[PDB]
From a paper:
Human transthyretin (TTR), a homotetrameric 127-residue protein, is the main carrier of thyroxine (T4) in celebrospinal fluid (CSF) and the second main carrier in blood. TTR also interacts with other proteins, such as retinol-binding protein (RBP) and thus contributes to retinol transport. Interestingly, TTR also interacts with amyloid-β (Aβ) and plays a protective role in Alzheimer’s disease (AD) by sequestering Aβ and reducing proteopathic stress. We also present the crystal structures of Fe2+, Mn2+ and of Cu2+ bound to TTR crystallized in the presence and absence of Aβ(1–28).
In order to investigate the importance of Mn in the TTR-Aβ interactions, TTR crystals were soaked in 5 mM of MnCl2 at pH 6.0. When TTR crystals grown at pH 6.0 were soaked in 5 mM MnCl2 under conditions similar to those carried out with Fe, Mn was found bound to Glu-66 and Asn-98 in monomer B and to Asp-99 and Glu-66 in monomer A, with minor local changes. More globally, Mn may influence an A-A′ and B-B′ asymmetry. The separation between the central Leu-110 residues (B-B′ Leu-110–Leu110 separation of only 6.73 Å) suggests a rotation of the TTR dimers in a direction opposite to that observed for Fe and Re-TTR structures. The conformation of the TTR-Mn complex with a distance Asp38–Asp38 of 19.2 Å is within the range for distances observed for wt-TTR with ligands (e.g. 5EZP37) and even a wide selection of mutant TTR structures including those subjected to heating (PDB code: 2QEL38) or to a pH as low as 4.6 (PDB code: 2G4G39). No significant conformational changes were observed, suggesting that even if Mn binds Aβ31, it does not play a relevant role in the interactions between TTR and Aβ.
Numbering used by the authors:
A (entry chain A), B (entry chain B), C (entry chain B), D (entry chain A): 10 to 125
The structure:
Amino acid sequence: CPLMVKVLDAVRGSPAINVAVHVFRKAADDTWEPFASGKTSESGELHGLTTEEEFVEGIYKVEIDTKSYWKALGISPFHEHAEVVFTANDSGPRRYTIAALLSPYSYSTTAVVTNP
Amino acid sequence: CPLMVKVLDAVRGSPAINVAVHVFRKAADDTWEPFASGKTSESGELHGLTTEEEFVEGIYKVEIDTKSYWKALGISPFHEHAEVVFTANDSGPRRYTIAALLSPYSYSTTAVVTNP
Amino acid sequence: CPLMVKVLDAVRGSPAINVAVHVFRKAADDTWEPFASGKTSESGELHGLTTEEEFVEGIYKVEIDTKSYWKALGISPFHEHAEVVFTANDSGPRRYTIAALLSPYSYSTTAVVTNP
Amino acid sequence: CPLMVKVLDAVRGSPAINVAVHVFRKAADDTWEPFASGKTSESGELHGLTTEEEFVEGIYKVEIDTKSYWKALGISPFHEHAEVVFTANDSGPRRYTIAALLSPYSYSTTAVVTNP
Ligand SMILES: [Mn+2]
Ligand SMILES: [Mn+2]
Ligand SMILES: [Mn+2]
Ligand SMILES: [Mn+2]
């Protein structure tokens, strides 16, 4: 995959399972267009969002639906979702892993960017 | 005083100084309306964004312009900006501090919510 | 005032209150000697650990007793404690703030190093 | 592996390669005994530290040599190393992944604990 998402739960020390993820790409008129979506697996990973053909240069937004995740666990969290906004493939195709570490009042996000 | 922002720089171990911060409030047509903005002080803090009267329950977005901060330091970053989206809720008298810790390819954000 | 500790609780979005903190200094036989200790205040802070006179260059260890904090909240944690080991260096007048953000299975720590 | 270490570099957005890792186990006389050591691979991962037979109940310390890592990159960091101290296998054998995210003045650590 050129774009992969990995989500961990810092309260349980486990992958964050069944987290909804929505990806958007900024259009020429400066609006967010839907690009791809999915849910994390039992390993907290989401693959197969896109192909290298479709994943062109652009500004992307990866929205990780954290409030929904915590609420299904009976926790009322602070954030609505985590939003990761970045320019992709500006110097040629790259492989991107977006990692997120979730707590109820806190999250972290890291990008690991590799040249295929 | 009901909403404060604090930004730290994980590379230099220092407050992140002169970072632009824009706050938005979600309108009833589900678009983001400008609400308040400022730049971080020498201590990495931004106070006086809003007042208790103006800061009603709703969904707010705090956007921290991290890319321009790193570009000014000669460092190539990943994110366009950091985005913290949350619901403000009345329960008792409460202060919101949004803290953000920045790295070029990573950031974390935490909400400290306390009483008067 | 040359060394301060600040601890936040990522689960509740609050200062971590009444966390024991022990500071050690590495002796010439490479063992840890007790240096200072305290408990975090209502604001999650611990001041007055040392003085400028006493805080000479050397290797210091700050140990934050996180397990007992989580056990007191009924939450099962991973770490025995958080450990921050660093060298204090003279260059100009400098203040060290060790900040720590706690989750049951995760923590982060940052050093904010500033001038007078 | 029952014990795995993964290290990421938050300045480069890449695995942290060639990071030395030393593992210790607390002995009955309350001293740290060497238990295993190794270096992260090109993927930032360290496997094969131990076997399920040798990885008994105990208090372990995983010391990640962060100062050495940054210095070889020409960066003078704050911390001497990251220290992760935890009780392992207290309720029966588990599989442990210790993840660390490194910046010069900051690091994060998370444990992912799975039941084989
Ligand atoms: Mn380009
Ligand atoms: Mn309400
Ligand atoms: Mn010196
Ligand atoms: Mn046991």
